[PDB]
Design a protein around this ligand. Structure first.
Ligand SMILES: Cc1cn([C@H]2C[C@H](O)[C@@H](COP(=O)(O)OP(=O)(O)OP(=O)(O)O)O2)c(=O)[nH]c1=O
Ligand SMILES: Cc1cn([C@H]2C[C@H](O)[C@@H](COP(=O)(O)OP(=O)(O)OP(=O)(O)O)O2)c(=O)[nH]c1=O
Ligand SMILES: [Mg+2]
Ligand SMILES: [Mg+2]
Lengths: 197, 197
């Protein structure tokens, strides 16, 4: 019997590249706060971990900070996945699955995460699967081109993202495609594709 | 309810400094193994995580590797704490508590863990406490002098531990005292103190 098992409503995960408009899309649901559990913009947690900006530290020095940063992403997603609600609907920006299948995998490929750091994160994912219930009934995938993602990133202008290269977003885009369109990853529930260009 | 709640027998934790004799002490129960769940020598997991020696890497480069290493230590302890058994007694070498209250404390103090890494591990520890059940009925404390621990470490001669100085063991000793003697930490059930010198 897993933690939070049987405590969760029908759950929708809002996914897509950085700057695909996940927060914008979820903002339309806000007037319905009373009926829907909305867990949005988890990045604010990562930018301020009791005063520490892990997002900043990660981009400045990935070979040292990518590991703690992803471990903390994993935690905050878990907190949101397992958060109690009395409501019939929960909608989340991001999920433990995108952290794992896109970000962690990409950082393994680019060498930000050495094998040992990758292995530790992966062993955690496996234990989490056996011990903690992650409700997932629908994923809405905001599909975008890397060029479009890139312009939104620049317009929003997060200081931490000011050095994010187009190639990185191309890498992440394909990984979202692998996961949500080509079913290269084990995880499976309904996916609704939307054009966010 | 938390993961593993109501699944665990009376649980004994064996604690003490590096080289204090936890495994040696647990060896005395080997003939009772069919009636006691015995989880010994977790360092063997940390020396080989699919071929990666996390212990070795932590000691060669703590500013980089102490974080992922402590994260994996935490995981493996948790795997042992929550492991199913039909036996009426469980005895474990180490616990999540000594990893948190002794090793992580010391690595933060000596600057092996930056605030960001420290904060990440602590946020995990907090969530684990909410989500995962850790059975703890007795701690047996194999109390040693740092000097004797040092001798035993040198005799055993783990290559990973070749550069461990007496000062490090003195530091850990006072953190074991702080927790198990002075009780300046949260719970810790009853403690039975043994002279392992
Ligand atoms: C989920 C996740 C985000 N990140 C980073 C990428 C971004 O710099 C930042 C937030 O990314 P996103 O999770 O994509 O959030 P966003 O607000 O940028 O998305 P949108 O514009 O569609 O609303 O965190 C990781 O490094 N690893 C991760 O696992
Ligand atoms: C539990 C723990 C151990 N360690 C390290 C210290 C040691 O080098 C190694 C194993 O230490 P110990 O957990 O003390 O195990 P041991 O086998 O050396 O003890 P004993 O001789 O009493 O049987 O792991 C950490 O770095 N962090 C931790 O949280
Ligand atoms: Mg957003
Ligand atoms: Mg031992």
């Amino acid at each position: 019997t897993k933690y939070a098992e049987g405590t969760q409503p029908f759950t929708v995960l809002i996914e897509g590249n950085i700057g695909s408009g996940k927060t914008t899309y979820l903002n339309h649901f806000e007037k319905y706060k009373n009926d829907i559990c909305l867990l949005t913009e988890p990045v604010e947690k990562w930018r301020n971990v009791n005063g520490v900006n892990l997002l900043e530290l990660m981009y400045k020095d990935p070979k040292k900070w990518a590991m703690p940063f992803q471990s903390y992403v994993t935690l905050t997603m878990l907190q949101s996945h397992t958060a109690p609600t009395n409501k019939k609907l929960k909608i989340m920006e991001r999920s433990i699955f995108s952290a794992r299948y896109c970000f962690v995998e990409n950082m393994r490929r680019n060498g930000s995460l050495e094998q040992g750091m990758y292995n530790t994160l992966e062993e955690w994912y496996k234990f989490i699967e056996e011990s903690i219930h992650v409700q997932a009934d629908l994923i809405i995938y905001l599909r975008t081109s890397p060029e479009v993602a890139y312009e939104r990133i620049r317009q929003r202008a997060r200081s931490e993202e000011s050095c994010v290269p187009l190639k990185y977003l191309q890498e992440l885009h394909e990984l979202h495609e692998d996961w949500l369109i080509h079913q290269r990853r084990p995880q499976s529930c309904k996916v609704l594709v939307l054009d966010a260009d």
